[PDB]
Each structure stands twice: as structure tokens, then as C-alpha cells.
Amino acid sequence: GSLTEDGLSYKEKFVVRSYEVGSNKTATVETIANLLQEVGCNHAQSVGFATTTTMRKLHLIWVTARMHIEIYKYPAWGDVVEIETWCQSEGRIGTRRDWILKDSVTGEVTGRATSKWVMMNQDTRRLQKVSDDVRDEYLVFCPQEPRLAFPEENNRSLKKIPKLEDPAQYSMIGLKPRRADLDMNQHVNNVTYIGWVLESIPQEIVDTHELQVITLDYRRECQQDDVVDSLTTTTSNDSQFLHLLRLSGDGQEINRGTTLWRKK
Amino acid sequence: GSLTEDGLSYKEKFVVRSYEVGSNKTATVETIANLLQEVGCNHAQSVGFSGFATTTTMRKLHLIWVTARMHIEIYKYPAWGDVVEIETWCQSEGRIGTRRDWILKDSVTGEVTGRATSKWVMMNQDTRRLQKVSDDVRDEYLVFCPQEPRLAFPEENNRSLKKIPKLEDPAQYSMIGLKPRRADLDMNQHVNNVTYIGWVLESIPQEIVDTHELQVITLDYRRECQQDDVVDSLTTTTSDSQFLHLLRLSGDGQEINRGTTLWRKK
Numbered sequence: 001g002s003l004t005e006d007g008l009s010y011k012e013k014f015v016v017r018s019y020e021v022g023s024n025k026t027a028t029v030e031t032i033a034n035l036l037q038e039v040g041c042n043h044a045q046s047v048g049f050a051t052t053t054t055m056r057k058l059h060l061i062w063v064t065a066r067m068h069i070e071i072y073k074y075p076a077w078g079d080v081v082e083i084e085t086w087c088q089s090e091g092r093i094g095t096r097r098d099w100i101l102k103d104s105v106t107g108e109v110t111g112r113a114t115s116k117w118v119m120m121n122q123d124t125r126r127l128q129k130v131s132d133d134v135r136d137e138y139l140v141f142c143p144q145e146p147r148l149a150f151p152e153e154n155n156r157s158l159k160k161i162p163k164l165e166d167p168a169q170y171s172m173i174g175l176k177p178r179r180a181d182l183d184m185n186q187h188v189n190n191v192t193y194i195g196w197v198l199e200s201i202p203q204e205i206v207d208t209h210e211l212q213v214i215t216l217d218y219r220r221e222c223q224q225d226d227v228v229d230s231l232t233t234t235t236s237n238d239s240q241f242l243h244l245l246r247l248s249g250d251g252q253e254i255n256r257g258t259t260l261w262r263k264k
Numbered sequence: 265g266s267l268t269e270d271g272l273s274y275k276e277k278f279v280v281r282s283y284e285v286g287s288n289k290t291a292t293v294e295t296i297a298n299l300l301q302e303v304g305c306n307h308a309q310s311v312g313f314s315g316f317a318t319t320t321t322m323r324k325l326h327l328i329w330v331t332a333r334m335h336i337e338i339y340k341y342p343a344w345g346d347v348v349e350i351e352t353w354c355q356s357e358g359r360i361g362t363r364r365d366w367i368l369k370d371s372v373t374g375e376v377t378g379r380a381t382s383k384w385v386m387m388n389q390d391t392r393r394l395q396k397v398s399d400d401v402r403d404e405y406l407v408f409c410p411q412e413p414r415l416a417f418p419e420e421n422n423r424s425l426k427k428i429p430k431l432e433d434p435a436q437y438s439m440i441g442l443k444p445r446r447a448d449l450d451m452n453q454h455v456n457n458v459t460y461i462g463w464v465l466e467s468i469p470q471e472i473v474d475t476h477e478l479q480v481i482t483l484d485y486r487r488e489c490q491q492d493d494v495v496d497s498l499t500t501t502t503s504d505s506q507f508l509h510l511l512r513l514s515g516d517g518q519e520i521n522r523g524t525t526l527w528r529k530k
């Protein structure tokens with residue numbers, strides 16, 4: 001992998017592995033999401049790191065508020081997929097990281113993703129707007145003119161997600177993270193929540209449809225000793241669902257989302 | 265990745281990923297086990313196989329290879345961003361089945377950082393009945409194996425061939441109600457063998473994991489966990505720290521795996 005010529009974006013190629021694919025012999029959306037995370041990590045390392053001395057001094061970290069992925073073609077087992085990533089400042093709100101996925105052999109865009117990140121105190125979990133001093137330290141690593149993976153003026157990446165009402169049409173209860181679901185800091189990996197959301201989709205939908213779009217909002221973190229319930233209701237050629245992840249006991253919301261599926 | 269010059273073994277390099285490491289910023293034993301599986305798959309493809317390593321004779325009789333035992337020893341877990349080189353080969357073990365071995369090395373130093381061995385047996389994919397290999401099938405795979413013995417674990421009467429006892433109730437530690445999600449399934453909708461390693465490790469206390477490093481794991485595979493099954497993971501200290509393990513179905517207590525782990529103080 002490497003930064004591009006202008007040093008404002010990062011590209012990396014990946015060969016799809018045997019254990020990374022589903023029943024269609026193509027990469028699952030969780031493998032794709034892990035690869036997005038990996039190319040994001042490699043981008044931060046290549047530019048010198050994604051926390052500066054100033055963020056480290058104030059105990060601030062970047063946390064994901066929203067993730068939006070659209071896949072036109074899932075790469076097959078043994079195929080090479082090229083992923084390009086970049087960041088852009090969104091004023092005082094936070095930052096946005098975008099991705100473009102391409103088939104390395106044809107050069108055609110097979111997918112795209114966008115994510116919203118906000119600054120949070122590591123210890124108190126309190127959110128805050130971006131200070132001018134912190135924002136100005138990261139601007140030298142972003143393209144200055146807008147560069148959007150989802151340009152469309154009415155794109156599904158910025159749609160507001162409602163809260164699922166009980167009773168849910170489908171459910172998967174008692175979901176718990178194991179050590180493989182944790183990152184190097186013992187926190188639940190963001191991709192695990194995507195897997196948990198998908199667990200409440202019926203197997204018949206998964207067997208006859210392909211996931212085209214997933215939008216996920218992150219409200220609260222699942223701790224290593226928490227238990228989660230995954231709720232889904234059909235809202236809809238295509239099938240659309242509304243999703244909710246909440247703690248098994250008190251019903252505290254951890255995520256909400258939407259998925260769009262197309263017939264195979 | 266590629267077959268070596270003699271075409272009797274396969275080598276592949278991997279760069280360790282950010283999501284593949286644990287709290288020590290080194291690859292977990294589950295990432296290592298997935299890489300062993302991946303280099304095994306790439307070896308079968310390189311020697312001509314289009315399912316897993318099944319010849320047309322096995323395909324006509326509906327026979328598949330299934331893991332009976334997995335044994336892994338790690339001296340050093342590769343760090344995040346490091347390149348690890350893995351070499352794999354197979355050997356026929358007469359009529360019993362086959363053995364697949366692996367050697368892990370640090371690509372920069374060339375030193376052996378780990379080794380693994382596994383026992384595979386032939387099974388009918390529909391009835392799940394075990395069978396001897398027979399001359400006709402064994403003779404079709406011999407051209408892909410070294411003829412002289414080549415063992416990742418040469419030592420006479422070593423840890424890889426030790427008999428594992430059945431854990432007696434009550435267990436010292438336990439993790440109950442473990443269930444597979446879609447990410448735990450392979451391309452044939454069966455639970456991936458590496459998930460059972462994760463489930464075994466779930467009943468080790470967090471304090472042991474925080475102060476020790478896993479050096480050895482031996483796992484026997486008795487029965488498969490189905491997509492709608494629920495598993496209990498049981499562990500008792502038998503001692504470094506050594507543990508005896510048992511995975512069984514949550515309800516009727518049917519055994520699915522038994523194993524042992526050996527851990528070294530950090």
C-alpha cells in the first residue's frame with residue numbers, strides 16, 4: 001500500500017481469502033468493512049501517526065458516528081480488490097472518511113463507502129465540537145476542495161434513520177462478543193455491530209438476495225460483558241429493512257440502521 | 265504464494281493486519297489458525313484442485329477430508345505490520361488418513377516462530393460415516409506428498425500425539441450459551457474450525473490471558489456444531505499454566521471438542 005502522488009489519499013490491494021467469503025464464494029460485507037478499517041489504519045500510519053500530540057494531551061479520540069456502505073459487486077475468492085481512502089474536514093462537526101473499491105483487473109468501481117467521525121474524551125465519553133487548533137493540525141492531510149464518494153444531492157448516505165417500534169418483525173436475542181470480536185484496546189470492533197445487525201435478517205432473504213446498501217448509526221458502545229438483542233422489521237424487486245441493536249436487559253439503544261437488498 | 269521447486273510444499277507471506285491483533289499488538293492464535301487454513305487452501309489449488317482437496321474419485325463417492333485433531337505451538341506471535349512466511353506440506357499416514365504440517369517464520373530474520381500439525385480423516389459428506397482411505401484414493405494423492413517423512417514435530421512421543429482425557433464435572437471455569445453468527449460460517453455454511461479454538465479460549469479467565477501468553481494448544485474434533493446449536497465451554501487447571509478443556513452442546517451435553525492449552529508467564 002501507498003499514499004498517492006499528491007499525498008492526499010492512500011491506496012492498497014488485497015487478495016480475497018478462503019475464510020473471508022460467504023455461500024456465493026464472494027467476500028462478506030464484514031470482510032469488506034474490516035478491509036476499509038485496515039486501509040484507514042495504513043493511511044494514518046503513512047502520514048506520521050489517528051491522534052496528534054494535541055489530541056493525546058487532551059485525552060481525545062476519534063469515534064465513528066455513522067458508517068454507510070454500497071456494494072455493486074462483491075469480489076470473488078482469489079480476486080484482487082483495490083481500495084482508495086481519503087479524509088475531509090467537515091468544519092467543527094467532525095471529519096469524514098471516504099472509500100472507493102475497484103476490481104484491480106478491470107479498474108471498475110465495485111463499491112463505495114463513507115463514514116462520519118466525531119471527537120470524544122477517552123475517559124468521560126463526552127462528545128465535543130472540533131477546536132480550531134486541533135482541526136488546523138489535520139488539514140495538511142486532506143484535499144482542500146470537496147471530494148465525495150457519494151456526491152448525489154439526495155444520496156442515501158445522509159438519510160435520517162427512525163427508531164424501530166416494538167414488536168419487531170424478526171429478532172436474534174442474547175448476542176455476546178467473544179475475544180475475537182475485540183480490537184487491540186479490548187473494545188468491541190465496529191464491524192461486529194454490522195454482523196449483529198445482519199443476524200436478525202431471515203436466512204431465506206440472505207439465500208435469495210444480495211446486500212446492496214447498509215447505513216449504520218453508532219449511539220453507544222457494547223462492553224465486553226454486555227448482551228445484545230438484534231431487531232429487524234421490513235419497511236418495503238428490492239427489500240428494505242429497519243434495524244435496532246439494544247442491550248438485552250434494560251433495552252438501551254446501541255445502534256440503529258437500514259439495509260437495502262436486491263434479488264439474485 | 266507458490267509451490268517450492270520440487271512441487272512438494274507451498275509457501276506464502278502475509279502482512280499482519282490491525283484487526284488481526286490482540287491487546288499485545290501481536291496476531292491472535294485465531295488469526296494464525298485462519299492463515300494456516302488459507303495457506304492449506306492455496307496449496308490444494310496450486311496442485312490442481314478446483315470443494316477442498318477432493319479428487320474426482322472422492323467426489324464420485326461423496327467423500328471429504330475432515331479435521332480429527334489440530335496442534336499449534338507458537339514461540340513468537342508476529343506483530344502488527346510484520347510479514348510472516350508459512351510453509352505447508354501433506355503426508356499420507358497409510359490407511360489412517362493424512363497429516364498436514366506447517367512451519368511459521370519471521371520473514372525478516374528467517375527464524376522459526378511457530379509450528380503446527382493436523383490429522384485429517386475421510387468421511388462421507390451425507391451420512392457423516394468415517395472410513396479408511398483405501399489404496400485407490402491414497403495412490404491418487406501420493407504424487408503431491410514428500411515420500412520420506414518430513415515432520416514439523418519430529419521429537420519421539422511429543423505433545424502433538426498425546427491422548428486427551430475428558431473433563432469431569434464440576435468444571436473450574438465456564439462460558440455458557442456460545443452461538444455461531446454468519447461470520448463464523450465457511451462458504452459451505454458449516455462452522456469454521458477456528459471458531460472452536462475461540463470458543464475453547466473463552467472459558468480461560470481474563471487474568472490468565474492478561475498475564476500469560478498461549479504457547480501450545482491441542483484440539484480434538486469429535487462432532488460438528490450446527491448453525492442452530494448452542495455450546496458450553498468448560499476449563500479446569502491441570503498444573504507455566506496448563507488447562508484441560510471441553511466444548512459440549514448446552515442442552516444434552518453432547519461432546520463436540522476436547523483439548524489442552526499450555527501458557528507461559530509474560
Ligand SMILES: Nc1ccc2c(c1)S(=O)(=O)C=C2
Binds near residue numbers: 040045087088095138
Ligand atoms: N483527522 C484526520 C484528517 C486527515 C487524515 C487523518 C485524520 S489520518 O491520519 O487518518 C490520514 C489523513
Ligand SMILES: Nc1ccc2c(c1)S(=O)(=O)C=C2
Binds near residue numbers: 304309311362
Ligand atoms: N490428501 C492430500 C495429500 C496431499 C496434498 C493434498 C491433499 S492438497 O491438494 O492439499 C496438496 C497436497
